[PDB]
Every structure is written in structure tokens, then in C-alpha cells.
């Protein structure tokens, strides 16, 4: 390539001025808001050397009529009139250039459109709007090839672990063309660096063309190439289908430059110096400060009306984790906080889940959790909804060009995407407001699922920023799914933090530059997942690795969760208490994985600092990719080693909320993924002190042991993958107030004792034991007389109706009971041997081997009593008991909560009388049925359907059957046809068909096809040697009827006491009558709904006999 040339500059008709601070001088054109040149400590950076007196308004080239006025020694102002009648532009804008110490600020302070535009109202011509304002062509800062050390360094979005998003370019003549959007961008010489910020929400496309708030351009001027950094275009007045967006969607354009000398004392001026300084001019995502102390992220799940994780239970999880980490901070994402749970009732953000305890319990959760540094988030959706939802309306739904619905997710119900732009223009904000109003303060984060994939239309930079603003404005912190989403505002990205998702192309932001800048502000990065290669092969800064134990994707592994925290997350978060100061790459390595062989340049040393001048140095132990040392690091704090390879002894001087700890509370964590002794040098403030070590368990600090200090050092030879904590004085564990708010103490058996129960019988027969998932359970076995455990139920309301259940898994034929005595009345419920495996995937006690009760299975099901308090609640008792038996009964989780069911002879309390279920006041699940094994252990596709006329009912979008038969609730099964298996069943503990007694079972039902579903009668444990069922196949309810059909069956209780009834998915094929896809799922061909179940004991007379 030949030495390049361009026009020289004739500034003969230009009148320049200057504005300046004490350190930075800027020469500016009086004709146009352009900076010719910057000067600092006698060094120079050019700006836009070649005048370019145009802008672009709605992509029309405009020569503005400009008037100048210097305001003070640092500030100038420009009024800029904009006229183009051919394109209906008639407006003006005021711009200010202002120097502030070493920063240059560019602000459009004011915009007037002389065309009539009312935000919120119709406009007849969208071209009358002032939509876009572009100052491309006027570089805010640049560097010339004639200057020593001239380079440009910029970041683009990359989520592929193999591909860096960063460009590093020498500015030379000649050099390759450059016209490209960037997220972050820096120019420098050997003397000065500059960085540029803009609030432009410009996009040039997806992927690495998105989040392109800056634009870098090479321009050739005389005999030099210049690389300048411009703000990309800004957005202003916008509409959707003629409706102008709200005023809050308009943000005044703004950009800033910062110019610096060597800022990390490495005696070199480069992009890093600019990145350090850039932190003083950049946007900071709201709530970023909290991130560094949220060490324990996870999800607590509810789904399909089951209430797997009530709000108050979640607080017990928080307390376990508080103990096991010794006060590390926590972030719990409540997936299914609303409606019937996860993927129910979307868009009605304020509809907090009633069956998990509603808003009252949620508030109590948030409040009590503060002291444990536990922040709560919720999973919401702004892209799709279901007919059940209050906000399902035809006007909001997304249609395809041909008029068809753009169908969304299908699982419990078939959803339909919404038009996000339409939603924004029609009151979206108010939904967030309703939630804030209802819930009050203290919620940390909103996690908006799905947004960023285009289901709802445009989900790009502009729309994401508007959305994020709606949420931030209520006081909430923003979180997103995708690695590539909400770059301006997100603090957390699910697909970055859960390393397992998506594979090497869909992880966090693979940009040295971007992580240097914002590592401490968010979890959006590439963590350690060797199989993805490149940046994911042991990043020196770690990167959040998220695991779960409260039901998300069937995850239940508590211990794994805790060992993961210490293995990845403690050091990850440690670094987030500092800002990166220096970043050193080593030599390119070759790697092979995921089908390619490729070059990767790894980071070898990263330094960080804090406001107290503490210095952290992280060093990779080798640059040889095939050496074990490539995946090892040393970390030093002010010169002292705190990690080396597989082990670390890290100080931690922050309580759970991140507050500086008092001196007597400073501590150190030890963790080592290997066996073997490690030896460590203590800091001077520990070296002459006694030192005690504790092993951290779910019981807190254990196994106190004073350590021997020899020559300022300690030596630790302890269990691998086991956390320990070190103090300079003897520590104790506090009272946790287990299950506070839940009317009983320690409902989940996490307190390590039973002393708070009053035990009748041989107490040696009752023990706390661990499931195969290390879930602590009450076990009663080997007992020759009745054994009982009793507590008062405390803090109840007088004259109030209640439900209480206990999870029970009975391996004995012995009666196992739950009994409530209110002081004026006694009620009891029992089970003999359990006969139904648990198949609720988000429930902690499902039958998956790794969280099985015993013998690789779980029959846990909730066993209920229904009672009503009197005038006096001082002496209400709850009793768990077991009659004599050799085998074991396991009990876990006692939940007492308000319920207005009227199931027994039209009365609430457990008693005699006809059993009715209208599904209008279910406590949780699908009682008296429990989900069967038709889909195995799963987010079961049977739930309680909620009514919304007309959208859930016959006729709407051609729907064939009603979601809801009477009242507001029915029992619905979605598309579970042709499975030859049991969908759900009763169980003796929920309803017992007494030996030899005869019952009439009646219900109303809807069914989309003939003989897809059948009412069945069985006994004992069902097996698909398959079990005998009395089978009654059921016809469709709509071809020859306008409403649900009524069915009636006689059932006689087997002598074994273990008769049950249910619904079975036949092997017959369904009939979608020519419909397919979304239409077919929506309209209900493959559906079954039950309502108004009744079971009456009867004596066979007259015609009942025939
Ligand atoms: C990974 C993730 O967040 N995926 C979202 C989907 O999640 C699934 O939800 C179903 C129940 O509806 C089930 O629990 C699966 O285990 C879970 O992965 C889902 O919420 C959809 C809705 O559009 O969005 C994401 O893909
Ligand atoms: Ca430097
Ligand atoms: Ca438990
Ligand atoms: Ca009903
Ligand atoms: Mn539903």
C-alpha cells in the first residue's frame, strides 16, 4: 500500500476561540461545535482538524445556521437552526462545549421542534418528528500518524469465547480503512490517552454492530492519517404506528471526552490509562455498587400452582447459606414469584403469587433478609403473555404480516408474543408502578427474561435502555438473560453467569477492554469453563459461576452449590472490590475445541487497586497452554500471597451487605480444591495474634482449633473442597430464628436439634437425617410404641381458617399422622405406606436419584389438615406422630398458612361429610390429586387454570374448550395426549376410599378429542409389570355440547385401603381437525380440564345397583 494523502487544511475563513480549565485547553470553532485541538501539560491531541459543518437530522444532510456565545472561561454555547422543507425539518438545538478539569463535555442542552408533536398522541406524518440527530463527521478526539506512539483501541460485543471483540490498531500512513462502530474507544500517543463516552443508543446491526455508541473513522489530512472517535447518532422523538412514544423516552444527547497522562504508573501511555480515566465520565448501571458483595446468586423456583418455594421458606435457605459462608452476601432470583409460578400470568407484574404467601410474605422475606445481606430479584417478561393474564388483549398481541398471531412459548398454556413497541406506547410503565406500589421498597433486581431475542419485536439498544429506565426508576436494578443484552444498563446476565448454558458462542462479553473498565460493576463476563476454550480457559479474574439448589431446572444439590461458591465465586467477587489498573497479555497460544483449531492471546497479569491504595496482582503461572500452570494463578495483596494454584487464603473485610467490618470481625477464608498442606504468610496485623480456624458447615462455624504461628506463618492441611474461616478471636454462631413468620420453629429441620419439639414416646426413635440430596428430614423408625413430636403453632390469627401440611414419605404400613389441636377442637390426617412417587421437578423432594429420600426414590407428598382458630390462639399445637413399625417415615417441611377451602360437607375443617373440590381455594398443587409420572420428573404440564373471559374460554381464537369450567379456577392439563400414562392421581392421605365402602365420584370436564384421556381407578403403587386400571375413556366435550360434560363413576374401596382415582393419557391419537402448530395447541384439541369434583359415600340402593 502506498503512502496516502488528503486535502490540507485552509483555516483562513475560520474564527477559533478557546475554553479551558487549569489543566486542559480546547480550541474550538465559533462556527460549529467542533474541537480542533486539545492541549495538556504541553502535550497535544487533535480533535476534528478538518471543518465539517453539517449534521444529519432524520438521515437528511443539514447545514445548520449557527450562532456562538462563549459563556465563561470553560464553556461555550451554540444555537443551531435546522431547516429542510423538502423533508419537513424545522427545528433548533443548543449545544454546549464545556471543559471540566481534564474532561471535555458535549451536551445538546435543548431541542425545539416547530412541528406539532405531542408525546402520547397520534401524529399524521412520522417524518414531522425529530427522530435522529447525528454529528458523525465531527470527531470528538483523534490521533495522527505523524505523532509518536499513535494508536487506537476499541471494543465491540463478542460472546464467542474464541473471538475477542477488541481491535488494537496502529495509526499509520499508510493504514487500512476504518469506519466502524464501537462500544468503547481510545486514542493515544506516547504522551496522552483519550476515551470517549456517549449516551447514543445507536445500533448498526446485531452482534458486534450493536451497542455502537461510538464510531471510529480514519480520515487522511495532508500527509497523515487520523483516527478519530465520533459519537454515533442520537435518538429523540419516535413513534410506533403513528403513536408518539412517551416523553420519558427522550434523553438529551450527551458525550464526554477524558484526556489523561500515565495513570497506572507503568511509565507508558496507552488505552489502559484512558480506560482508568474513562470511569469518571461513563454511565454507571444502576445498582452496580451492590454487585461486588452479592457472592451467592441462585434461583428459587415455583411453577404450575405447586408452591415448591413459598416466600418464607426461601428465608430459611438464606439462613443456611448465611451460616455456611460466614456472612457472605446473596442474591436470590425468585423465578415464579407471580401468579401460579414460572411462566404463568405474564405482564401482570403486580400479581404476586398468592399460593406462595402473597405480598405479605414477600415483604416479610425482603425485610428479614436484609440483615443477612440477601437481596431479592424477580423473573418477569415483557415479550409474551397468556390469556389468563389481566393484560392479555387483542390490541397488545403481536401479529405477523399475514395477520396470523406470532405465537410464543407453550408449556402450561399456549402464549402469544406481544408487540413491545405497542406496549411501550400504551401504558407499559404503569405496570411497573403498580408493582412498586403494591410491594413497597427493598426489592433489588428485575430480571427480564427472553428480551433481546426479538420475540416482541425490537429489543435493541434504544428499546432496552427505555425499558431499563422504567425499571430503574422504581428503584430496581436491571438484569437480563443474554450475554449480548442490556450492555448499557444490565448488572447481571444469566447466560454469562450460568456457565453451562449455550456453549462457547453465547457466553459473557469477551473483551479485555470492556472487562478492564467494568469488571467490578457487573457479572457479564467470561468465567472458567475449559471446554469452551479461549477466554474461558481459566480467566485470571474468574467470572461468576451460578448454580442452584431450589428447583430451577431440577437443581437440588446444596453441597455442590456451596463448593462451587468457594471454588469460583469468592475470588471472583474479591476482585470486584477493586478496579483493574493494568492488564498484560502474553504470547498467542494454539487451542483446539468445539471443532476448530485457533489462536488465542491470553491475559497473563492483571493488577487492581482500591481507594486505600491496596494493590492486587494476579498472575497466570504459565503461558504454555498445555501446562497445568496455564490454569493456575498467584494472587498477591500488597506483595503477600493469598492464592497460589489450587488453594487460597483470602482476607474478607466486608459484612454481607458490603460494609467495612470492625477489626475484631475481620477474617480470612481458606479453600483448596486439592488435598495437601499449604503454608501462608500472615499480614503484620495478624502475625503476632492468636489465630483460630473453623470448618464451615450448614451449622455455621464448627471444629474450633487454635493454630500455631511460626515465624509469622501458618500451615494448613485440611479437607479438600471444604471451606474454612479464620479469626483472631473465638467466634460463636447466632440464633437464626428458623422459620420465623411460619408459625413453627425450624419447619425444614435445618437447626441441627429437635429439642424445640416436645417428644412423646422413645425419643431415640426420632432423628434428623440427610436425604440422598443432603436435605435434612425428620425420621421415625424402629419404634414399638407410638412416637410423637409436638410444637405450638405461634402467631396465628384468631377466628381464621388455616391449612397446614407436612411433606411425608412413608416406607412403613404404620399410620403416620399430622394432628392439629386448636384448644377447642382436634383434627388429624394420616397416611400408611406412601404409593405415589413425586414428579415435581422444581420440588426439592422429587424422585430423581440425587435428591431421593432413600433407596434412590421419593414418595414425598404433602399431607394436610384443615382447621380454624377460635378466639384464643395461645395453645394451638401441631403434632407429628408414627404408630409402631420397623420401617421409616420421613417428614420434611411444615407449612401453616391461610386457606378458605370448603371441602368437607361445605365446611373448611377436616371432617366427615361429602368431599367437594371446586378448585377455587386450593392451598397448593392439585389436591386431592398429585401429579403422576406421565412426563417423568418435570415442570408438570398440569396446573390450575385461571379464568379471563373471553380469552381463556370457548370461541376466542376458535378455542374449542374452556380453560375454566366454573368460577375462576379449574384443573387443566395441556397437550398431554398419546402418552399411555398416568397424568395425576388421588392418594389415601388426600382422600381415602375406605375399605369396603362405596363412593360416587362426579366431576365436570372438558376434552378436546375423543378418548385421549380416561378416568381411571387403581390401587397401590402404579406401574406403567404394568398395573391394572379400571379404564373409562372420555369423549370430547365440544362437537356435540356447548359446555363441559358431567361424568359419574362408582368406586368401592379396596380392602387394602389403597384405592385411588385419576386421569390417564391413553395411547389413542388426538384429533387436531386440520389445525396445526400454535393454533392447534391454543384451541385445546389436546387438552383436558376438570372442575367441580365431588366424592360422596353412598349405600347402593334401587337403580344404583344396575
Ligand atoms: C434458560 C431460560 O431461562 N429459558 C427460558 C424458558 O425456560 C424454561 O421454562 C420452562 C417452563 O415454562 C421450564 O421450566 C424449563 O426448564 C426452562 O428452561 C422459558 O421461561 C421461556 C419462555 O419464553 O424463555 C426462556 O427460553
Ligand atoms: Ca500507563
Ligand atoms: Ca429439610
Ligand atoms: Ca371451579
Ligand atoms: Mn395457566
Curated annotation (Swiss-Prot):
Q: Which family does it belong to?
A: Belongs to the glycosyl hydrolase 101 family. A subfamily.
Record's superkingdom? Answer: Bacteria
What is its biotechnological use?
Answer: Was identified as a vaccine antigen as it provides significant cross-protection in a stringent mouse model of lethal sepsis.
Q: What else is known?
A: The hydrolysis reaction catalyzed by SpGH101 proceeds with retention of the anomeric configuration.
Q: Which GO terms describe its cellular component?
A: extracellular region
UniProt keyword annotation of Secreted present: yes
Alphabetically, the GO molecular function entries are:
carbohydrate binding; endo-alpha-N-acetylgalactosaminidase activity; metal ion binding
Region entry Catalytic, spans:
287-578
Catalyzed reactions per annotation: a 3-O-[beta-D-galactosyl-(1->3)-N-acetyl-alpha-D-galactosaminyl]-L-threonyl-[protein] + H2O = beta-D-galactosyl-(1->3)-N-acetyl-D-galactosamine + L-threonyl-[protein]; a 3-O-[beta-D-galactosyl-(1->3)-N-acetyl-alpha-D-galactosaminyl]-L-seryl-[protein] + H2O = beta-D-galactosyl-(1->3)-N-acetyl-D-galactosamine + L-seryl-[protein]
Protein name, as recorded: Endo-alpha-N-acetylgalactosaminidase
The active site of this protein is located at 449, 481
- Entry's free-text remark on domains: Is a multimodular protein that comprises seven distinct domains. The catalytic glycoside hydrolase domain resides in domain 3 (residues 602-893). Possesses four potential carbohydrate-binding modules (CBMs).
Q: Where does Ca(2+) 2 bind?
A: 918, 920, 966, 969, 1091
State its Enzyme Commission number(s).
3.2.1.97
Bilayer topology term: Peptidoglycan-anchor
Q: Name the residues that bind substrate.
A: 343
- Task of the protein: Involved in the breakdown of mucin-type O-linked glycans. Specifically removes the T-antigen disaccharide (Gal-beta-1,3-GalNAc-alpha) from extracellular host glycoproteins. Representative of a broadly important class of virulence factors.
Tell me the enzyme class.
hydrolase
Task: Kindly list the positions annotated as binding Ca(2+) 1.
Answer: 262, 264, 266, 268, 273
Could you list this entry's UniProt keywords, alphabetically sorted. Answer: Calcium, Cell wall, Glycosidase, Hydrolase, Metal-binding, Peptidoglycan-anchor, Secreted, Signal, Virulence
Its subcellular locations are:
Secreted, Cell wall
Amino acid at each position: 500500500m502506498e503512502k496516502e494523502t488528503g486535502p490540507e487544511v485552509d483555516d483562513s475563513k475560520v474564527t477559533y476561540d478557546t475554553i479551558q480549565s487549569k489543566v486542559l485547553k480546547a480550541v474550538i470553532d465559533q462556527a460549529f461545535p467542533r474541537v480542533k485541538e486539545y492541549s495538556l501539560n504541553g502535550h497535544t491531541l487533535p480533535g476534528q482538524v478538518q471543518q465539517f459543518n453539517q449534521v444529519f437530522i432524520n438521515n437528511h444532510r443539514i447545514t445548520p445556521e449557527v450562532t456562538y456565545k462563549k459563556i465563561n472561561e470553560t464553556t461555550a454555547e451554540y444555537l443551531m437552526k435546522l431547516r429542510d422543507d423538502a423533508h419537513l425539518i424545522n427545528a433548533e438545538m443548543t449545544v454546549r462545549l464545556q471543559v471540566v478539569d481534564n474532561q471535555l463535555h458535549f451536551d445538546v442542552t435543548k431541542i425545539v421542534n416547530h412541528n406539532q408533536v405531542t408525546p402520547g398522541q397520534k401524529i399524521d406524518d412520522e417524518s414531522k418528528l425529530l427522530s435522529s440527530i447525528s454529528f458523525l463527521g465531527n470527531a470528538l478526539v483523534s490521533v495522527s500518524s505523524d505523532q509518536t506512539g499513535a494508536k487506537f483501541d476499541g471494543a465491540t460485543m463478542s460472546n464467542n469465547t474464541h473471538v475477542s471483540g477488541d481491535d488494537h490498531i496502529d495509526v499509520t500512513n499508510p493504514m487500512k480503512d476504518l469506519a466502524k462502530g464501537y462500544m468503547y474507544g481510545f486514542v493515544s500517543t506516547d504522551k496522552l490517552a483519550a476515551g470517549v463516552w456517549s449516551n447514543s443508543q445507536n445500533s448498526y446491526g446485531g452482534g458486534s454492530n450493536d451497542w455502537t455508541r461510538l464510531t471510529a473513522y480514519k480520515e487522511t489530512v495532508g500527509n497523515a492519517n487520523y483516527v478519530g472517535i465520533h459519537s454515533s447518532e442520537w435518538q429523540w422523538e419516535k413513534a410506533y404506528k403513528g403513536i408518539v412514544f412517551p416523553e420519558y423516552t427522550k434523553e438529551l444527547p450527551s458525550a464526554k471526552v477524558v484526556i489523561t497522562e500515565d495513570a497506572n504508573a507503568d511509565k507508558n501511555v496507552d488505552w489502559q490509562d484512558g480506560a482508568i480515566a474513562y470511569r469518571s465520565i461513563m454511565n454507571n448501571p444502576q445498582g452496580w455498587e451492590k454487585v461486588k458483595d452479592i457472592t451467592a446468586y441462585r434461583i428459587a423456583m415455583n411453577f404450575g400452582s405447586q408452591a415448591q418455594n413459598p416466600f418464607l421458606m426461601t428465608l430459611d435457605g438464606i439462613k443456611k447459606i448465611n451460616l455456611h459462608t460466614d456472612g457472605l452476601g446473596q442474591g436470590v432470583l425468585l423465578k415464579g414469584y407471580g401468579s401460579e409460578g414460572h411462566d404463568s400470568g405474564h405482564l401482570n407484574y403486580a400479581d404476586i403469587g398468592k399460593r406462595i404467601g402473597g405480598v405479605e410474605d414477600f415483604k416479610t422475606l425482603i425485610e428479614k433478609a436484609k440483615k443477612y445481606g440477601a437481596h431479592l430479584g424477580i423473573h418477569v417478561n415483557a415479550s409474551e403473555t397468556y390469556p389468563e393474564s389481566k393484560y392479555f388483549n387483542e390490541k397488545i398481541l403481536r401479529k405477523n404480516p399475514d395477520g396470523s398471531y406470532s405465537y410464543g412459548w407453550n408449556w402450561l398454556d399456549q402464549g402469544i408474543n406481544i408487540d413491545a413497541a405497542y406496549d411501550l406506547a400504551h401504558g407499559r410503565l404503569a405496570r411497573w408502578e403498580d408493582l412498586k406500589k403494591k410491594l413497597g421498597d427493598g426489592l433489588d433486581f428485575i430480571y427480564v427474561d427472553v428480551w433481546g431475542n426479538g420475540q416482541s419485536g425490537d429489543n435493541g439498544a434504544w428499546a432496552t435502555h427505555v425499558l431499563a429506565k422504567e425499571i430503574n426508576k422504581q428503584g430496581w436494578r436491571f438484569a437480563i438473560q443474554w450475554g449480548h443484552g442490556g450492555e448499557y444498563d444490565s448488572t447481571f446476565h444469566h447466560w454469562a453467569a450460568d456457565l453451562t448454558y449455550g456453549g462457547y458462542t453465547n457466553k459473557g462479553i469477551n473483551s479485555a477492554i470492556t472487562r478492564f473498565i467494568r469488571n467490578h460493576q457487573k457479572d457479564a463476563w467470561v468465567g472458567d469453563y475449559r471446554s469452551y476454550g479461549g477466554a474461558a480457559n481459566y480467566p485470571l479474574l474468574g467470572g461468576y459461576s451460578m448454580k442452584d439448589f431450589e428447583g430451577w431446572q431440577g437443581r437440588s444439590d446444596y453441597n455442590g452449590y456451596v463448593t462451587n461458591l468457594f471454588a469460583h465465586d469468592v475470588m471472583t467477587k474479591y476482585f470486584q472490590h477493586f478496579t483493574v489498573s493494568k492488564w498484560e497479555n502474553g504470547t498467542p497460544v494454539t487451542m483446539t475445541d468445539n471443532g476448530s483449531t485457533y489462536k488465542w492471546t491470553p491475559e497473563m497479569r492483571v493488577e487492581l487497586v482500591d481507594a486505600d491504595n491496596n494493590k492486587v496482582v494476579v498472575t497466570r503461572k504459565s503461558n504454555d497452554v498445555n501446562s497445568p500452570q496455564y490454569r493456575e494463578r498467584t494472587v498477591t495483596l500488597n506483595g503477600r500471597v493469598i492464592q497460589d494454584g489450587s488453594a487460597y487464603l483470602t482476607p474478607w473485610n466486608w459484612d454481607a451487605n458490603g460494609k467495612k467490618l470492625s477489626t475484631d470481625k475481620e477474617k480470612m477464608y481458606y479453600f483448596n480444591t486439592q488435598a495437601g498442606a499449604t503454608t501462608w504468610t500472615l499480614p503484620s496485623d495478624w502475625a503476632k495474634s492468636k489465630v483460630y480456624l473453623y470448618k464451615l458447615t450448614d451449622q455455621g462455624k464448627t471444629e474450633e482449633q487454635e493454630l500455631t504461628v511460626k515465624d509469622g506463618k501458618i500451615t494448613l492441611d485440611l479437607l479438600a473442597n471444604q471451606p474454612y474461616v479464620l479469626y483472631r478471636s473465638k467466634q460463636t454462631n447466632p440464633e437464626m430464628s428458623w422459620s420465623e413468620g411460619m408459625h413453627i420453629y425450624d419447619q425444614g429441620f435445618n437447626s441441627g436439634t429437635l429439642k424445640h419439639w416436645t417428644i412423646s414416646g422413645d425419643a431415640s426413635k426420632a432423628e434428623i437425617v440427610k436425604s440422598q440430596g443432603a436435605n435434612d428430614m425428620l425420621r421415625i423408625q424402629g419404634n414399638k410404641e407410638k412416637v410423637s413430636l409436638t410444637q405450638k403453632l405461634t402467631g396465628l390469627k384468631p377466628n381464621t381458617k388455616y391449612a397446614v401440611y407436612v411433606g411425608v414419605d412413608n416406607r412403613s404400613n404404620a399410620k403416620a399422622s399430622i394432628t392439629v389441636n386448636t384448644g377447642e377442637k382436634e383434627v388429624t390426617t394420616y397416611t400408611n405406606k406412601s404409593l405415589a412417587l413425586n414428579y415435581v421437578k422444581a420440588y426439592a423432594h422429587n424422585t430423581r436419584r440425587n435428591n431421593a429420600t432413600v433407596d434412590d426414590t421419593s414418595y414425598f407428598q404433602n399431607m394436610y389438615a384443615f382447621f380454624t382458630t377460635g378466639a384464643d390462639v395461645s395453645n394451638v399445637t401441631l403434632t407429628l406422630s408414627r404408630e409402631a413399625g420397623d420401617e421409616a417415615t420421613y417428614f420434611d417441611e411444615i407449612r401453616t398458612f391461610e386457606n378458605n377451602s370448603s371441602m368437607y360437607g361445605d365446611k373448611h375443617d377436616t371432617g366427615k361429610g361429602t368431599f367437594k373440590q371446586d378448585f377455587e381455594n386450593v392451598a397448593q398443587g392439585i389436591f386431592p390429586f398429585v401429579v403422576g409420572g406421565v412426563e417423568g420428573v418435570e415442570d408438570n404440564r398440569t396446573h390450575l387454570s385461571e379464568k379471563h373471559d373471553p380469552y381463556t374460554q370457548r370461541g376466542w381464537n376458535g378455542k374449542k374448550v374452556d380453560d375454566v369450567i366454573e368460577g375462576n379456577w379449574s384443573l387443566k392439563t395441556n397437550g398431554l395426549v398419546s402418552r399411555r400414562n398416568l397424568v395425576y392421581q388421588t392418594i389415601p392421605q388426600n382422600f381415602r376410599f375406605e375399605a369396603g365402602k362405596t363412593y360416587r365420584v362426579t366431576f365436570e370436564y372438558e376434552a378436546g378429542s375423543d378418548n385421549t384421556y380416561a378416568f381411571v381407578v387403581g390401587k397401590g403403587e402404579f406401574q406403567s409389570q404394568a398395573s391394572n386400571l379400571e379404564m373409562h375413556e372420555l369423549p370430547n366435550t365440544w362437537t356435540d355440547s356447548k359446555k363441559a360434560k358431567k361424568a359419574t363413576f362408582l368406586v368401592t374401596g379396596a380392602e387394602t385401603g389403597d384405592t385411588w382415582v385419576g386421569i390417564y393419557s391413553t395411547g389413542n391419537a388426538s384429533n387436531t381437525r386440520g389445525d396445526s402448530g400454535g393454533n392447534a395447541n391454543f384451541r385445546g384439541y389436546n387438552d383436558f380440564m376438570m372442575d367441580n369434583l365431588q366424592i360422596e359415600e353412598i349405600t347402593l340402593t334401587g337403580k344404583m345397583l344396575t
